[PDB]
Design a protein around this ligand. Structure first.
Ligand SMILES: [Zn+2]
Length: 228
């Protein structure tokens, strides 16, 4: 069965977060590792994989380490030709090196024809009303929930100021994936309470490498505002 939906005390509140909200913004605002048709070159811990991947733009890294939930997942992908998409960090990253979690899909067999892109509808609720809906895209048949989440958050940062440097216009926020077998799961879009944001611990949720069928999955973002 599904992860049950958030109960009230399940969700992080931005007002109980007194660190820097730019640290969350930074992770999703035009920020991702993406590499295409790659094979792992190395390992640090038993559950991760290192890839030779350069950032086209700001030439910040040329090796990426992705950590996975378990050793079996690292074994499974070790020698496969894969596509990689995820959110990267430098704070507490050790192995121009950069770190992430999950983000791996096999290359072969995993694309639509004719260079087709698949649109995935994201419906945004604010205080339980459907205010906007937009579409994110992927060329991948089986896509990581991480990658879809990243795309949807990037759009929301720009359109709805989901995150700013100081804090957020929003108190709570979660993203919900509905699979066509009935399976649902969700991620808290807000930082853990306190004065520091731990990026590595935040992104750690993506280490399950959870993938969804792009063509049938639904996405709901549910946000609440500050007062009422
Ligand atoms: Zn591919």
């Amino acid at each position: 069965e599904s992860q049950p939906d958030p109960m009230p005390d399940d969700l992080h509140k931005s007002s109980e977060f007194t660190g820097t909200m730019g640290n969350m913004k930074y992770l999703y605002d035009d920020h991702y590792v993406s590499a295409t048709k790659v094979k792992s070159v190395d390992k640090f811990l038993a559950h991760d994989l290192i890839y030779n991947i350069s950032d086209k733009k700001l030439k910040n890294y040329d090796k990426v380490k992705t950590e996975l939930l378990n050793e079996d997942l690292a074994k499974k992908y070790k020698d496969e030709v894969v596509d990689v998409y995820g959110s990267n960090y430098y704070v507490n990253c050790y192995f121009g090196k950069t770190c992430m979690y999950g983000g791996i899909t096999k290359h072969e067999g995993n694309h639509f024809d004719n260079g087709n892109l698949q649109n995935v509808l994201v419906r945004v609720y604010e205080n339980k009303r459907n205010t906007i809906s937009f579409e994110v895209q992927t060329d991948k048949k089986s896509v990581t929930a991480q990658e879809l989440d990243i795309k949807a958050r990037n759009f929301l940062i720009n359109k709805k100021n989901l995150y700013e440097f100081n804090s957020s216009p929003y108190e709570t926020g979660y993203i919900k994936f509905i699979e066509n077998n009935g399976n649902t799961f969700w991620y808290d879009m807000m930082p853990a309470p306190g004065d520091k944001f731990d990026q590595s611990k935040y992104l750690m949720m993506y280490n399950d490498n959870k993938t969804v069928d792009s063509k049938s999955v639904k996405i709901e973002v549910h946000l609440t505002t500050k007062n009422g």
